[PDB]
Amino acid sequence: ELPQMVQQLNSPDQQELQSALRKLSQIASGGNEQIQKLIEAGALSPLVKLLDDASEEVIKEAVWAIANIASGNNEQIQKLIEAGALSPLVKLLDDASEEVIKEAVWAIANIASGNNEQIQKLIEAGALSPLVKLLDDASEEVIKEAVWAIANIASGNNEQIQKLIEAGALSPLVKLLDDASEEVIKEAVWAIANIASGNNEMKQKLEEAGALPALEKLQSHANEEVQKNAQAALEAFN
Amino acid sequence: ELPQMVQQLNSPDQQELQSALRKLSQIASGGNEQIQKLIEAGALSPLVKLLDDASEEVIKEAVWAIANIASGNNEQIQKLIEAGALSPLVKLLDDASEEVIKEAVWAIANIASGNNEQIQKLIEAGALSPLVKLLDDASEEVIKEAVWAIANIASGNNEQIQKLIEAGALSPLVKLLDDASEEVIKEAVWAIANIASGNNEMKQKLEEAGALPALEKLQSHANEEVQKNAQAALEAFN
């Protein structure tokens, strides 16, 4: 049962740890009632404490589990934030392999799918800068998830959107509309649509960044579905 | 279809609730025929009953839907008032996060865009004081929507405008003409223009509050769309 599993997360035998962790990820990928049992069994602190383990084999599994726990409700996200998850997750965005980073980004995007006070906690943890940097520096696979994390941040309040802009999000986002894969363009336009719902200073920043021509450019694109979303980003800008 | 979703708003599982709520919001942003189906399916009472739920995650979603339902016709606003919406919405203006409050304010402005009897119901529900307080205490984002709620109140009849004045609306509104962003000034002048169409005591209250210099001064403003509206506020002042 769950307390024995939880105890085993602290285990020095890497095999009973690794096996404990895997049973926990299994549960955490069950829906929100399964996540609730993990929370109520005390799984969250030791799990977050594993984000500092010497092998990225343990770390990857722990972040995957965390990504899934943060797919739960906002009270569940809040328990993850209280267990101290944000700081180590942010730290993985530059100190770990792309394989681990994709998972960290996923965790981070789900946390940012929480409320504004939770997005504020992400900002205070210094998430914004390493996320923005990934857009120039990472594989398209990773960039697709980063753009989604950025877009969730961009759905927060105007003070929050301005922090994105200060972190340099606009040019890398605008650039992604042009050349990248169609999946990414889609993700990018959605982020830009959120920013475009900001106040006039931000629209203006959007205009400055060259967004309107890039968006007007996409209404003549192969994919039917980005045309549609590119449209609504221009309407939202208007 | 709709009755099952409605039944689900009272579900003991938070995930089926939350997913039910989200479907309902989708519908409620679908124009007035969609709103009519929600009303006729009995959605309105349980939705309003959710404004007291323990998590603001449920609440935010329920207010967003209510904001949209009040975008409908005045008969539809009336059904929202009969389902008891006003009291919990007013209560959120001081007991909830800025994120929720923005939505509450939006709901409340739209209700105030109804007829005079519906604006009277907003007053009786105690809306005026927490709305006025927001103008000194909240982020420019929230203030912009509060000023628009206040203006819609100010388009009601003279007894109604006097209640605003009694609630202390004038000095905070006058102050916004100066120490604020251009989008807020615009919203503030429009509210003052409505008040300025009042009777001569209210004009005098307006003149006392220092409104004329602020309107004259910042008629001649960077933005010339505010010039235009600042003009008409002075013309309306006679």
Partner: peptide, 9 residues
């Protein structure tokens, strides 16, 4: 509406 969203995996 601002556009926030949560995924499984």
């Amino acid at each position: 509406r601002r556009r926030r969203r949560r995924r499984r995996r």
